[PDB]
Structures are given as C-alpha cells and as structure tokens.
CSV table of C-alpha atoms and ligand atoms in Angstrom, one decimal:
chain,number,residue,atom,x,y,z
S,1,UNK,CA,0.0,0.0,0.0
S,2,UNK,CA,3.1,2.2,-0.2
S,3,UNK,CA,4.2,4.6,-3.0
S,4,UNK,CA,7.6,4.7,-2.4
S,5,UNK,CA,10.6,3.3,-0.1
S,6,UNK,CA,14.1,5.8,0.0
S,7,UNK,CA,16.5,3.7,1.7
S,8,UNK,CA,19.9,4.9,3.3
S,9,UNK,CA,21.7,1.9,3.9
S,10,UNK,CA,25.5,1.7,4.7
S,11,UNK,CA,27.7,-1.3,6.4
S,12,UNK,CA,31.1,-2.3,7.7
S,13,UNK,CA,32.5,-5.5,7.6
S,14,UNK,CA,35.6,-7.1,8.9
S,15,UNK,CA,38.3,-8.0,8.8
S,16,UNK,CA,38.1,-7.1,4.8
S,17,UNK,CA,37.6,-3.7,6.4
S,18,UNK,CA,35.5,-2.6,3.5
S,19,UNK,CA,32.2,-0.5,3.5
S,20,UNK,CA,29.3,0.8,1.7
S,21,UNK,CA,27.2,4.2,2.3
S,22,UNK,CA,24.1,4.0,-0.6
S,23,UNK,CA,20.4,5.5,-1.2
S,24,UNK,CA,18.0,3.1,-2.6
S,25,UNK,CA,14.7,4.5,-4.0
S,26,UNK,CA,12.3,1.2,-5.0
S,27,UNK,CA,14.8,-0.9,-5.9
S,28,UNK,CA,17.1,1.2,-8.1
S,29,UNK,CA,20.5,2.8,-6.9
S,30,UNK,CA,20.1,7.1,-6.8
S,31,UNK,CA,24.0,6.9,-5.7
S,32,UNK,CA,26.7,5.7,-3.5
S,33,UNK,CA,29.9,7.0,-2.2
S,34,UNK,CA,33.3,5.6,-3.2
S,35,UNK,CA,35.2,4.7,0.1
S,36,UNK,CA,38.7,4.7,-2.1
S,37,UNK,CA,38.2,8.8,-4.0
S,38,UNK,CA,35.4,10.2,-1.1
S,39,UNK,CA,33.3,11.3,-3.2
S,40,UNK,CA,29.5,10.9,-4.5
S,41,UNK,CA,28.9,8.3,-7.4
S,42,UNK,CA,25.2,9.3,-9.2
S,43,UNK,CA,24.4,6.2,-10.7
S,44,UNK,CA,23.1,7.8,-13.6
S,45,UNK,CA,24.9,10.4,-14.8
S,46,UNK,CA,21.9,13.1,-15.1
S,47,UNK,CA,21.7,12.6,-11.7
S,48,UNK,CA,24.3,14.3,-10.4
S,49,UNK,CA,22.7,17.7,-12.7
S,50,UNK,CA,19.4,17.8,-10.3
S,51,UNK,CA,20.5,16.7,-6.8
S,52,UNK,CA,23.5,17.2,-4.2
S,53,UNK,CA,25.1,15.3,-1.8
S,54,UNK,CA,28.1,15.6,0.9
S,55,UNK,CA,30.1,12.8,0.7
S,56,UNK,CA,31.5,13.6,4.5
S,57,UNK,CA,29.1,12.7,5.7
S,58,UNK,CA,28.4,9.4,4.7
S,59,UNK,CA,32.5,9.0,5.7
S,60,UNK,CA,31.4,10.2,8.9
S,61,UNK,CA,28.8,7.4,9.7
S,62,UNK,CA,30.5,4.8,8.4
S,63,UNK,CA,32.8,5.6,10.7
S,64,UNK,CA,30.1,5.1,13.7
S,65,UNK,CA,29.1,2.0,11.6
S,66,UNK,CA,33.1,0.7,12.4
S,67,UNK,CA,32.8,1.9,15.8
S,68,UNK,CA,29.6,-0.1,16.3
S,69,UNK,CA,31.3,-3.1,15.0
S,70,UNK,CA,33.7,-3.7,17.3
S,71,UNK,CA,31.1,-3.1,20.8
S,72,UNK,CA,28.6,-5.9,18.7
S,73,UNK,CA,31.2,-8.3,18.0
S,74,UNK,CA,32.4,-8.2,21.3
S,75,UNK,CA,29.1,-8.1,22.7
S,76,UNK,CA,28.1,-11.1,20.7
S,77,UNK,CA,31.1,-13.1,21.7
S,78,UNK,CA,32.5,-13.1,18.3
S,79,UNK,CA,29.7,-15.2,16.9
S,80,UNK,CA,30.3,-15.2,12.8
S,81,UNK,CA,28.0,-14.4,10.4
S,82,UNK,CA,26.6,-17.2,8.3
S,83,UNK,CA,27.1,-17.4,4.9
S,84,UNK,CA,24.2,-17.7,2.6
S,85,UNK,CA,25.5,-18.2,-1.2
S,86,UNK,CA,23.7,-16.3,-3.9
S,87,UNK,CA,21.5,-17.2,-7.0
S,88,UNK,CA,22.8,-16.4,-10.1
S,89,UNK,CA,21.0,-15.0,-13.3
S,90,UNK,CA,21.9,-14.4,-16.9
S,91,UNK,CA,19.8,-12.1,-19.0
S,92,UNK,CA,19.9,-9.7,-22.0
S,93,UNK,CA,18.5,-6.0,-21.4
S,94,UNK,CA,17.0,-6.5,-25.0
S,95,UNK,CA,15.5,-8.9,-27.1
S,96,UNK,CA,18.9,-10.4,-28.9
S,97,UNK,CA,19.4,-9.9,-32.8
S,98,UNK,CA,22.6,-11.4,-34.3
S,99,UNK,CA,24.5,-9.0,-34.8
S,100,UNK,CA,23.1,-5.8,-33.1
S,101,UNK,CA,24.7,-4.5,-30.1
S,102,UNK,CA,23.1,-5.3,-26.7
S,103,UNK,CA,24.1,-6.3,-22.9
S,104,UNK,CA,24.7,-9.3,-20.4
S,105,UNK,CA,23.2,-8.8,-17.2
S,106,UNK,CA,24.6,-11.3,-14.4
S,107,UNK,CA,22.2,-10.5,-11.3
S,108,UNK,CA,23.5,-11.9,-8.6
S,109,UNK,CA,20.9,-12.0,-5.6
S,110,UNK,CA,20.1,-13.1,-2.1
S,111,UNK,CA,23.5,-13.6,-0.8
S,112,UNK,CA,25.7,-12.5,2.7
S,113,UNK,CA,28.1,-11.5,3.6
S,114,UNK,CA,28.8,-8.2,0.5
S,115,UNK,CA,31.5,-9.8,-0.6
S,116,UNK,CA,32.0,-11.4,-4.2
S,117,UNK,CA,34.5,-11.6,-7.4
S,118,UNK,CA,32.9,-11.6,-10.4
S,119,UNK,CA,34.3,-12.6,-13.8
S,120,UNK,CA,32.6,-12.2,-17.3
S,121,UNK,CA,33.8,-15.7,-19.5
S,122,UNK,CA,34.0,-15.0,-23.7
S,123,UNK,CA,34.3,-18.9,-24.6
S,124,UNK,CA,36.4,-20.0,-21.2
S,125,UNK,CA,38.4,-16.6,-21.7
S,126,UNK,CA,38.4,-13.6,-19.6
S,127,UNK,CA,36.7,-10.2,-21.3
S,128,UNK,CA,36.8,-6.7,-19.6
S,129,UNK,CA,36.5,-4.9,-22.6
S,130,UNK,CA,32.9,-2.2,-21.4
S,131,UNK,CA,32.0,-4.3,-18.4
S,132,UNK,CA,30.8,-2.2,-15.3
S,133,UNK,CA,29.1,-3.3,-12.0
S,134,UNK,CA,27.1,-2.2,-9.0
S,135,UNK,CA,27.9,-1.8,-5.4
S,136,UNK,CA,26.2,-3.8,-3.0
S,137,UNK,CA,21.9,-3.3,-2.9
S,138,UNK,CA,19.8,-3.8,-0.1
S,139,UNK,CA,17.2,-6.4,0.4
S,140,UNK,CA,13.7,-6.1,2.4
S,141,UNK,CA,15.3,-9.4,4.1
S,142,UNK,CA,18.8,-7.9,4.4
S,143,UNK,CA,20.9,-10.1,2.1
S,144,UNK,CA,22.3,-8.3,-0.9
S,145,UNK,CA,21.8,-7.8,-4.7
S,146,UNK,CA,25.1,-7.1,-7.2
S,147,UNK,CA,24.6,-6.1,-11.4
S,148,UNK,CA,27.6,-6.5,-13.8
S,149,UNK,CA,27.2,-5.4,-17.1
S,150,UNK,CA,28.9,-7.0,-20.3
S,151,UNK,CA,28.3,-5.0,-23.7
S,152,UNK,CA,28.9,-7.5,-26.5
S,153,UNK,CA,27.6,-8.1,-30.2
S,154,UNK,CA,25.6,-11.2,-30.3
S,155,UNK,CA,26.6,-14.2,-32.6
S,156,UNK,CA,26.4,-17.6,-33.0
S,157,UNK,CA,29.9,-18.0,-32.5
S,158,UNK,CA,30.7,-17.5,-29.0
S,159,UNK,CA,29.4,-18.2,-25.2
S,160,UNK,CA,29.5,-16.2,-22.1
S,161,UNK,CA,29.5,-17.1,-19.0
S,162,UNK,CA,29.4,-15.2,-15.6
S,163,UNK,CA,31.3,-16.4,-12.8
S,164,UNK,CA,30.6,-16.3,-9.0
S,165,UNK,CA,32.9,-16.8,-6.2
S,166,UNK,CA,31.8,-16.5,-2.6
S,167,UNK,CA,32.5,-17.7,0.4
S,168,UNK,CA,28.9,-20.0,0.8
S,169,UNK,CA,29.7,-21.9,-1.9
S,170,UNK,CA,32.2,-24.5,-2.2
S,171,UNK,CA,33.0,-23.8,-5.8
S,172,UNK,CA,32.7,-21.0,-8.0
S,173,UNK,CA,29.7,-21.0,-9.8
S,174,UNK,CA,29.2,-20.6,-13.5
S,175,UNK,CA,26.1,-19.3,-15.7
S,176,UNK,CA,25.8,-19.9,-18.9
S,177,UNK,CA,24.5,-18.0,-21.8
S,178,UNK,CA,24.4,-18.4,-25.6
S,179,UNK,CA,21.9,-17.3,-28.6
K,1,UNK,CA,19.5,21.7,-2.2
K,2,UNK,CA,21.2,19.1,-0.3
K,3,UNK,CA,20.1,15.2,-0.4
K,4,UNK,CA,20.7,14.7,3.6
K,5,UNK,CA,21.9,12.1,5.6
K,6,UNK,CA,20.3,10.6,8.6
K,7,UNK,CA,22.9,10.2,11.4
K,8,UNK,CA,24.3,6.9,12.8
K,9,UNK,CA,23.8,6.0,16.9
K,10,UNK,CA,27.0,5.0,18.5
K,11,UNK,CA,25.8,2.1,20.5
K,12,UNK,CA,26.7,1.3,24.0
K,13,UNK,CA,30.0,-0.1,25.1
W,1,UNK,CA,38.5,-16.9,9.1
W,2,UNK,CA,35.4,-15.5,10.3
W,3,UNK,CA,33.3,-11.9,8.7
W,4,UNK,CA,31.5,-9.7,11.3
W,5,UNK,CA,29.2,-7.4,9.7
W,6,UNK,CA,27.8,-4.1,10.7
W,7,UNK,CA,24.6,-3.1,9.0
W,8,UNK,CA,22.4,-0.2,9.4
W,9,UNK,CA,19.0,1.2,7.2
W,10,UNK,CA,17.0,4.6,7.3
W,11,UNK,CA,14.2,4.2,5.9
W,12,UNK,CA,11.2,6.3,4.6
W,13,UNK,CA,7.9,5.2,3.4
W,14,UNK,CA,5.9,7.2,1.7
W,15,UNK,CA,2.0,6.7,1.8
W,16,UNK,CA,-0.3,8.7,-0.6
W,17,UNK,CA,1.9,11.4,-2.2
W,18,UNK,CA,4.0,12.6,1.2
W,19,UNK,CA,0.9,12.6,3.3
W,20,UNK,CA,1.9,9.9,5.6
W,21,UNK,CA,5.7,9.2,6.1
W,22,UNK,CA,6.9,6.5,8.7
W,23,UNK,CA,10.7,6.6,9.3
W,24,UNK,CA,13.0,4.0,10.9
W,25,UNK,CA,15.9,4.0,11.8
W,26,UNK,CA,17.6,0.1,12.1
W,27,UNK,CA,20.6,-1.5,13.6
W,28,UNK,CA,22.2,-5.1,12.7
W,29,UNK,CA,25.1,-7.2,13.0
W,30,UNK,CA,25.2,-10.3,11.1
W,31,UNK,CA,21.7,-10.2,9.4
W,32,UNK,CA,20.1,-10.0,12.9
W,33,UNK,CA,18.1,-6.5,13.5
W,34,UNK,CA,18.6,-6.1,17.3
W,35,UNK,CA,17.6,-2.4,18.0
W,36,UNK,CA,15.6,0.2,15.6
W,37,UNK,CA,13.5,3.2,15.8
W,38,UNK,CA,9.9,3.4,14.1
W,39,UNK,CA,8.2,7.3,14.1
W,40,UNK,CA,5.2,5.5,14.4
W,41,UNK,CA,6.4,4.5,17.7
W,42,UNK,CA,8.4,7.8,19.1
W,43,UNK,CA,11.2,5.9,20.3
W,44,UNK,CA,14.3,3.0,20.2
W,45,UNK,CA,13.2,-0.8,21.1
W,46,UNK,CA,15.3,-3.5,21.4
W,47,UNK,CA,14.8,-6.2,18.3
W,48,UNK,CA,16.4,-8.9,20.2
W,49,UNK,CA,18.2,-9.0,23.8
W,50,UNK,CA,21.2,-8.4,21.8
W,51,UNK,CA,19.8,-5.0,21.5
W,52,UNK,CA,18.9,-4.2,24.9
W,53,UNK,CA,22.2,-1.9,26.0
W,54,UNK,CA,21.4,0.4,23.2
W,55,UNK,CA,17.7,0.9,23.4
W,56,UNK,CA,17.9,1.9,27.4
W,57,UNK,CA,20.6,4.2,26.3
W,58,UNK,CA,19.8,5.8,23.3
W,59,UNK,CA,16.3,6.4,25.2
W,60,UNK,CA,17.8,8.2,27.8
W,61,UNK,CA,19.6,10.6,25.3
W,62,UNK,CA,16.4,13.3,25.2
W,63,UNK,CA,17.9,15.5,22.4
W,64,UNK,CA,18.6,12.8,20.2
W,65,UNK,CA,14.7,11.7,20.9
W,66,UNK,CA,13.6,14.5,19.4
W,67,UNK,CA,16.7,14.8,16.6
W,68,UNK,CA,15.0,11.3,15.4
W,69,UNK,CA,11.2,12.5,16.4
W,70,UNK,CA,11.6,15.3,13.1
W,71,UNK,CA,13.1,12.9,10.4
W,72,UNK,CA,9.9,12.3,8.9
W,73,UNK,CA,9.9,15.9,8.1
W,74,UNK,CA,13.7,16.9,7.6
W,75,UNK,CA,14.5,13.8,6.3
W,76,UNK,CA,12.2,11.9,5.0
W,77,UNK,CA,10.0,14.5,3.4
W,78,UNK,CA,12.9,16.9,2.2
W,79,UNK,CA,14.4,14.0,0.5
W,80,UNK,CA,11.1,13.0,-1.2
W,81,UNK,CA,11.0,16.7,-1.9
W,82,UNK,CA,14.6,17.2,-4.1
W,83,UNK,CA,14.6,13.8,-5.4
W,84,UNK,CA,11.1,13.4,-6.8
W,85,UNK,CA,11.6,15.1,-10.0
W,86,UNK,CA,13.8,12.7,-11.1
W,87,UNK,CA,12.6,9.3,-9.2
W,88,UNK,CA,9.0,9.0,-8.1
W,89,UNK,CA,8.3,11.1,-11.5
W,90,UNK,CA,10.3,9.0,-13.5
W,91,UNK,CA,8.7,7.9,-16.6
W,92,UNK,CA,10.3,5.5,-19.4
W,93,UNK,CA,8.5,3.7,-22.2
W,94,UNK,CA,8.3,0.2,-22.8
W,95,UNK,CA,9.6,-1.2,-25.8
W,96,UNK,CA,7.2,-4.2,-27.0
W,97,UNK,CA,7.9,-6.5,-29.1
W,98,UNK,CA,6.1,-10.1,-30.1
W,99,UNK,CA,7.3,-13.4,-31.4
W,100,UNK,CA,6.9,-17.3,-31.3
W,101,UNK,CA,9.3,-19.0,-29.4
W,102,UNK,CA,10.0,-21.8,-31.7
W,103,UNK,CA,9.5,-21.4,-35.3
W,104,UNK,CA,6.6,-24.1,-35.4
W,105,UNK,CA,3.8,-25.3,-38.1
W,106,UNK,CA,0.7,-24.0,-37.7
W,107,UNK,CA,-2.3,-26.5,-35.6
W,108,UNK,CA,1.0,-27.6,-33.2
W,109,UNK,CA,1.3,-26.1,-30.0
W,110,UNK,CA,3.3,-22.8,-29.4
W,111,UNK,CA,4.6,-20.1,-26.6
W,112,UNK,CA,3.9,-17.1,-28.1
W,113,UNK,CA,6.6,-14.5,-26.7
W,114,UNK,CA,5.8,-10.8,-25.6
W,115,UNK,CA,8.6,-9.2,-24.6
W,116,UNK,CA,8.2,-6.1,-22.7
W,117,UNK,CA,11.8,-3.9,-22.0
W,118,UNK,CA,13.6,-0.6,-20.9
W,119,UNK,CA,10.4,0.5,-18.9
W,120,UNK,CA,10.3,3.2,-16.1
W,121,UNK,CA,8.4,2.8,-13.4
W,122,UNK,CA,7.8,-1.2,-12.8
W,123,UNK,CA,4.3,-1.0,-12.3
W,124,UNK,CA,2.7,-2.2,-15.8
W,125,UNK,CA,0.0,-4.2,-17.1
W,126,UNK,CA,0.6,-7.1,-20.1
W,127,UNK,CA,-2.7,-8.5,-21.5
W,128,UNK,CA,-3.5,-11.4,-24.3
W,129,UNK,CA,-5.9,-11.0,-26.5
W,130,UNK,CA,-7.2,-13.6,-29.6
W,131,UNK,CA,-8.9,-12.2,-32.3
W,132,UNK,CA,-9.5,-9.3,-29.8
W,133,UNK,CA,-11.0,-11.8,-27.3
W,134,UNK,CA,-9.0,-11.7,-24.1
W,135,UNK,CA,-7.1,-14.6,-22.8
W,136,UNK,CA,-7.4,-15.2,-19.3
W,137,UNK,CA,-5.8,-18.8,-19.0
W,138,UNK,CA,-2.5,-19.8,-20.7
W,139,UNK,CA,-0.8,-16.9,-19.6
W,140,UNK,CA,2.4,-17.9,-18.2
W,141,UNK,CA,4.8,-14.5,-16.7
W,142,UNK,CA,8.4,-13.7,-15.4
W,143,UNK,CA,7.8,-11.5,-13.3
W,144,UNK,CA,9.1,-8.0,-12.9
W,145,UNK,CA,12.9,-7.9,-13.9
W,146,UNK,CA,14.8,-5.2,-12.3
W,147,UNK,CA,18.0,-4.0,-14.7
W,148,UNK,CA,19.5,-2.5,-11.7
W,149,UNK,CA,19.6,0.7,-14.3
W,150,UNK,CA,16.2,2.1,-13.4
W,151,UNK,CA,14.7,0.0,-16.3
W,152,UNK,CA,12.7,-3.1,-15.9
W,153,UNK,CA,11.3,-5.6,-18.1
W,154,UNK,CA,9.0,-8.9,-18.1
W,155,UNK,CA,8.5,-11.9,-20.4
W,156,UNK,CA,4.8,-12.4,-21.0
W,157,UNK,CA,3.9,-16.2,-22.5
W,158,UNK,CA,0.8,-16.9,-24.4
W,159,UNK,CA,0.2,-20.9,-25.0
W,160,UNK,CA,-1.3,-21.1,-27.8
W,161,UNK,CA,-2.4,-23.6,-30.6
W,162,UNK,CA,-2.2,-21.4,-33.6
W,163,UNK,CA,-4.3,-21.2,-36.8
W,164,UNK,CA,-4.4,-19.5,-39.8
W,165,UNK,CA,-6.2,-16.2,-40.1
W,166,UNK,CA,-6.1,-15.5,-36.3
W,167,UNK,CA,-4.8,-12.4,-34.4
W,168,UNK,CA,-2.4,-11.9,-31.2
W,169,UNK,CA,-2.2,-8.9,-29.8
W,170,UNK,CA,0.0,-8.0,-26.7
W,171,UNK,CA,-1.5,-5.0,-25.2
W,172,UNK,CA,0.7,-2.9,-22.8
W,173,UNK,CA,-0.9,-0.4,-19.8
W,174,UNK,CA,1.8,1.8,-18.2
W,175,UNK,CA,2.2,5.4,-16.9
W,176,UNK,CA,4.2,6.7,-19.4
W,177,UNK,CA,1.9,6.1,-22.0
W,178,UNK,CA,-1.3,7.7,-22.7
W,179,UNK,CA,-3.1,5.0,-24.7
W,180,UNK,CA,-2.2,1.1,-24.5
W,181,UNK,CA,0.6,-0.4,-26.6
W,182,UNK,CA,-0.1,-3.1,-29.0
W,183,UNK,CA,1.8,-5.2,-30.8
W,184,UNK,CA,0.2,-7.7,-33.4
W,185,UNK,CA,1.4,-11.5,-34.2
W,186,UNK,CA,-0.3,-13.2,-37.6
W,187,UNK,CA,-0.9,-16.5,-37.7
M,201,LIG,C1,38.3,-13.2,-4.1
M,201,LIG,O1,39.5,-13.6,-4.7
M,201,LIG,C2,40.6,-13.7,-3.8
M,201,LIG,C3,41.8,-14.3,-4.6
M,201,LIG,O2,41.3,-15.4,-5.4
M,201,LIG,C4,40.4,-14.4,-2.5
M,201,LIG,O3,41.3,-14.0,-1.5
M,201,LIG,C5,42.4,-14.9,-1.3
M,201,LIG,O4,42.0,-16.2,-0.8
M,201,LIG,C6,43.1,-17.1,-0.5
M,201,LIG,C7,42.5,-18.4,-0.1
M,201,LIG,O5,41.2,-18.6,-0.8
M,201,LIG,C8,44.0,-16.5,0.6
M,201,LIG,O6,45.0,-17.4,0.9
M,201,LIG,C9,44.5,-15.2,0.1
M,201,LIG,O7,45.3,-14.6,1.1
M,201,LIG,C10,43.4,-14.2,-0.3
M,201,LIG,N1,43.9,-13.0,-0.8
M,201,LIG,C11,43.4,-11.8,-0.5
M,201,LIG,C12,44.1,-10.6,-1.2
M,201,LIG,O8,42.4,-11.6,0.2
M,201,LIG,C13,39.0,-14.2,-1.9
M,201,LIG,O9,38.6,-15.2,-1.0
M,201,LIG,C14,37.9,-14.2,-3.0
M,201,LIG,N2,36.6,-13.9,-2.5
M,201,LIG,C15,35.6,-14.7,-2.5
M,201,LIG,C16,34.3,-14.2,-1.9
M,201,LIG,O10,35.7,-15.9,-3.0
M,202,NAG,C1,-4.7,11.3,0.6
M,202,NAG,O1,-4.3,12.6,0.9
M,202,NAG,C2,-5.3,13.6,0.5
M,202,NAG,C3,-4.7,15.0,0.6
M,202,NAG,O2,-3.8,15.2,-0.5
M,202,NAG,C4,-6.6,13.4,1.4
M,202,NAG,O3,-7.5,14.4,1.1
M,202,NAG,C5,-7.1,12.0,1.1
M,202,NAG,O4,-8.2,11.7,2.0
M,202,NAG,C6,-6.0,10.9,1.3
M,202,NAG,N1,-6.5,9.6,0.7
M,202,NAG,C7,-6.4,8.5,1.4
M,202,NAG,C8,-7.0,7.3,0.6
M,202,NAG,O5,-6.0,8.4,2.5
C-alpha cells in the first residue's frame, strides 16, 4: 500500500575492512559514495545535474558504523555471520538480434556476507572490454543484490558465461548463456 | 539543495 | 577466518503522495536486527536482547529523541522533496515487441513470446488477446525484472495452438503512456 521506499543503507565489515554508504529508491541505486576517492557516485549520470550530496558525511557514519562493529562483535562473543551463497541469473537487457549491439546482465541476488568476485567468461576466456558493475543493494530481508554489465555483439559463434565466487559456496559457480 | 543524511547511533560499550 | 558485519537502514515510506511518512531507523550485525527506531512509535526498542544496552541508552539521550522524532519531516520529506523530480516522476516507455518461441507449423502447440523492455516505473500491465477476445488462462509471466539501471522488463507467455487467419495482440498499460501499446502477431 506504499508509494515509495528511500532507503539509506551503509555497512562495515571485517576483517576485509570494507564499507558501503548508498540510497536506494524502490529498488534502483540514486548513488553511492566511493570509500577509495570520497566522493558521491550518481548512478546515472543526469543525476548528479538535479540533486547534491556531501560525501563527509556518509565517511562520517561509516565511521560510527566501524565503531559499532567492534562493541557488537564483542558483545556477541564473536559469533560469525553465516554465509548464505547467492542465486545467479543471466539475461539480455533486450530482445537479442545477431548481430546488433546489446548487454549481459549477471544478477546476482540473495546472498551474505557483500563480498564477491565476479568474472565475465568469452568462450572460457576472460573479457573486460565495457564491463561495469554495481555496489552492493539492499534487500527487504537484508541479504544483498550485485549487477555486472557486459556490452557485447551477439553471434552464433561464442558463449558467455558469468562467474561467482563466494565464500557460501564450495565452488565458484558458473552461468551460462548463448543465442 | 542538499540530499541529507540521517545520522548513525554510537551504540553502548 | 570469520566476517562480522555491521549493517544499518534509514528508511522512509511514503504513503499517498508525502501525506503519511513513517521513518526507521535500524541497527544489525550479522543479518540479525537487534535495535531500531519506528516514528510510528516515538522511540528505540530493542529487536532482540542483543539489542537491549542500546535501546535503554539511546532512550535516555532526550535530544537525540527528538533529533529522530523530526526525520519524517527533515528527512524523509525533504528528500522526497529534491529527489522526486527525477525518481518517483520518473517515466520511461516500454519497448514491445512479439514473437513465437520456436518457429513451429501451424495446428502444433506454441509459446507465443511478448517481450516487454527498458520500462520506467515497474508497475505495468501485459494483456492477451485472440482475435480481440481476451485470454485469461495460458498466460504464463516472469515476473518483474529489475536491470538495476532504473529500467525493468518482463517476459509475457501466451500458450497457444495457432491457426491461420487469427490475431495476437500483446496490449501494454503503463504510466508513461497515454493509450495502451499493441503489438500484433499473424498466424
Ligand atoms: C576473491 O579472490 C581472492 C583471490 O582469489 C580471494 O582471496 C584470497 O583467498 C586465499 C584463499 O582462498 C587466501 O589465501 C589469500 O590470502 C586471499 N587474498 C586476498 C588478497 O584476500 C577471496 O577469497 C575471493 N573472495 C571470494 C568471496 O571468494
Ligand atoms: C490522501 O491525501 C489527501 C490529501 O492530499 C486526502 O484528502 C485523502 O483523504 C487521502 N486519501 C487516502 C486514501 O488516504
């Protein structure tokens, strides 16, 4: 019965020491702020031309988010967090025509702890030619959702395959696609 | 005008 | 070698334009919740015991009560405010198009394919119709397919036995168009 949903949501995780300050509006990414450069990352591009945002401050409370980390780990007798492994999905962002430019989507869904290496596969080889990805994106359950992108020219003569490690599964897994 | 931030809680030590 | 992971959500919902916002304010380690704070509720309760230290002290910090008891309006409906123009009015159309997916004889059986991409807002409607009849069973969906690009799309099956001289349409309702979308298939 809700419109809308703008979610803040940020963590810190050890001992990779790595974090994540983002704003969610239903679903879709309005931004996130790059822990490496400090500054605000629009996830479209037109974004950045309507809105503002201080990146020192999402520093700031990741910060308390570290801080809090250490009292709860300690406070929880340094209980581990159990892995859940993700699901894995393969899609096109258009209909495919041989020979017309178009995109791999590997979705990657459902999975904790934020932490994953992705690989796109051209026939068993390793392509990084146009490929970007997403940051980490909340989940009404609180496991996480990851996009990587793969711009390629669809053919009859080659497969693609995204590969997932994480820590929840034994072995990294694979998914396919071809025409 | 300014997309804010809502601040974090330091939680009890 | 063992993760610990700190978590933490603000959240606003919006409920009829911006007339009623509820705001929270949530704490986890490890996927547990353990302490939040709802404006529907004024303010922190523990989640879990695990929570406990922090609700009976944030509670007892009065100006940070009342610091949380206004983000519904400083928060919550400012950011509604200077995003909305380019989020909750958001509009993108959906590109439709139909086809069979196996190249079949007619009389056989056949999934008849409309594919619905690119769209902005998710929220959309994908009908079947047969010789401008609509069809109510064989409709196999999808689902809404989020891009993570602020575009969606769904897969809309009809399952059909084709014939010749019939018509397929895939009509499309969404809020960036004014009249429905319809794409044709001939038998
Ligand atoms: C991501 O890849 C790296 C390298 O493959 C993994 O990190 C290494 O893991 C090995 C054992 O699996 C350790 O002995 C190394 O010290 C690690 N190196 C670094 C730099 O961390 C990492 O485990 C992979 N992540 C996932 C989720 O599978
Ligand atoms: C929605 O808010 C309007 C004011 O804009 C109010 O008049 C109306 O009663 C509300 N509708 C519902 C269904 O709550």
């Amino acid at each position: 019965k809700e419109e809308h949903v703008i979610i803040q949501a940020e963590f810190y995780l050890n001992p990779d020491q790595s974090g994540e300050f983002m704003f969610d509006f239903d679903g879709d990414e309005i931004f996130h702020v790059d822990m490496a450069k400090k500054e605000t990352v629009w996830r479209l591009e037109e974004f950045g031309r309507f809105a503002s945002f201080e990146a020192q401050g999402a520093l700031a409370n990741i910060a308390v988010d570290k801080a809090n980390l250490e009292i709860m780990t300690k406070r929880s007798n340094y209980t581990p967090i159990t892995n859940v492994p993700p699901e894995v999905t393969v899609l096109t962002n258009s209909p495919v025509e041989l020979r017309e430019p178009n995109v791999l989507i590997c979705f990657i869904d459902k999975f904790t702890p934020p932490v994953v290496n992705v690989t796109w596969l051209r026939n068993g080889k390793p392509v990084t030619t146009g490929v970007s990805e997403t940051v980490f994106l909340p989940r009404e359950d609180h496991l996480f959702r990851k996009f990587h992108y793969l711009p390629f020219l669809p053919s009859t003569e080659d497969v693609y395959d995204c590969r997932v490690e994480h820590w929840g599964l034994d072995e990294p897994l694979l998914k396919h696609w071809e025409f | 005008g300014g997309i804010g931030s809502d601040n974090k809680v330091t939680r009890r030590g | 070698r063992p993760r610990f992971l700190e978590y933490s959500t603000s959240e606003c919902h919006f409920f009829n334009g911006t007339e009623r916002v509820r705001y929270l304010d949530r704490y986890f380690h490890n996927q547990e919740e353990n302490v939040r704070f709802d404006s529907d509720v004024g303010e922190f309760r523990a989640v879990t015991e695990l929570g406990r230290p922090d609700a009976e002290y944030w509670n007892s910090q009065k100006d940070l009560l009342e610091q949380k008891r206004g983000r519904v309006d400083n928060y919550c409906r400012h950011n509604y405010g200077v995003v909305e123009s380019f989020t909750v009015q958001r509009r993108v159309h959906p590109k439709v198009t139909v086809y069979p997916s196996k190249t079949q004889p007619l009389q056989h059986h056949n999934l008849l394919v409309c594919s619905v991409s690119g769209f902005y807002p998710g929220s959309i409607e994908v009908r079947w119709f047969r010789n401008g009849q609509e069809e109510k069973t064989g409709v196999v969906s999808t689902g809404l397919i989020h891009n993570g690009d602020w575009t969606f799309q769904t897969l809309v099956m009809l399952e059909t036995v084709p014939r010749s001289g019939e018509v397929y349409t895939c009509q499309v309702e969404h809020p960036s168009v004014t009249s429905p979308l319809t794409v044709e298939w001939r038998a």
